[PDB]
Amino acid sequence: MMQDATDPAVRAALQSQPSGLNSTDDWRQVMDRIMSLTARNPDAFRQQPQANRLSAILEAVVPARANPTHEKVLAIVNALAENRAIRPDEAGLVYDALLQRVARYNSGNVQTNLDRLVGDVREAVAQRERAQQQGNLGSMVALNAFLSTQPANVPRGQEDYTNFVSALRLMVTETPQSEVYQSGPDYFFQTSRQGLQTVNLSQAFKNLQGLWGVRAPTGDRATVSSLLTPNSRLLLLLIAPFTDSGSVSRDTYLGHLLTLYREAIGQAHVDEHTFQEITSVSRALGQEDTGSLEATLNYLLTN
């Protein structure tokens, strides 16, 4: 089990308010401790020195108003650090700039809002932290711009593309984390990893609009399908762990190559379980076994 982002209203409380005994806030906890009612040891208040004994009585029986503002205003500014509304080095300015703002306006209806906004801003950290795990929000809106600009449902050659419409939508829903459909240049493009080692254009996909339905030769790479760019080829291998059945595997490469993209993944996860064993058995071989990779090469070439 794991925690959510360390509670932003509590992190700032951790650094300000008393830890052990706040005699006013934890009143019936000190009162329980002084009445010899605590289950740990009853006479923990009796065996204590007489002077600090009296300090517990004066503070608990007469509750003293402790300063609450600096654990409320800091609760906003540290949430401003976790929601990233300010930079971490900005904690010197905004903490006091708003304290100087409430120095001028201590006593309007604004601070009655402020503590209600404290509960709102602390929840906004918890809302966004669960929302950044699903980076769908900066992805689906971007795909809405892709679906509108690109002409949808126009394969007047042959139609297998209706299945492909949902295939791109499945990539948004299944993996959301680093999967951002960034619109930097006017061509749309999707990143798969946190460092973006396969971020091809979804407008390199515009090469497929004339190749949505053509004739198939035989079983070896086609006499025509050499036109398919390694840019668009990178996309079609990336949608392959998402959609398989739907596109016709016998009419054009939209389906025949998509089934063949599963052959690339099908070998990969087998060889993953192959490599994790031969590398693990290095005590009995005592060599840099590149034959683990050479057999992997042999299991792809000699078929």
């Binding site: 010197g92 903490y95 006091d96 304290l99």
Partner: protein
């Protein structure tokens, strides 16, 4: 009821009473200091 060995030159008998004077350095605002001192066994504090 002090008593010393025979006096010749005019001298001040320096007597210290063990009193207790402590501070606390407050900072509610950055730049603004709130000052409070306390010598208790000498009717001083706050």
């Amino acid at each position: 009821t002090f008593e010393v060995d025979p006096m010749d030159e005019p001298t001040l008998l320096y007597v210290l009473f063990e009193v207790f004077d402590v501070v606390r350095v407050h900072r509610p605002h950055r730049g603004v200091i709130e000052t409070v001192y306390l010598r208790t066994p000498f009717s001083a504090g706050n």
